[PDB]
Structure formats: C-alpha cells, structure tokens
C-alpha cells in the first residue's frame, strides 16, 4: 500500500 513519495 502506497506511502506519500514511495509505493510499496
């Protein structure tokens, strides 16, 4: 699931 400048 995506964090603010990092998609994981």
Swiss-Prot record:
**Role:** Highly potent vasoconstrictor.
Q: Which part of the full protein does this chain span, and how long is the full protein?
A: 117 to 124 of 124
Please report the organism this UniProt entry assigns to the protein: Homo sapiens (Human)
- Could you tell me which cysteines form disulfide bridges? 2-7
Q: Where in the cell is it found?
A: Secreted
Q: Which family does it belong to?
A: Belongs to the urotensin-2 family.
Q: Which domain of life is it from?
A: Eukaryota
Instruction: Please tell me in which tissues this protein is expressed.
Output: Brain specific.
Q: What is this protein called?
A: Urotensin-2
């Amino acid at each position: 699931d995506c964090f603010w400048x990092y998609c994981v």
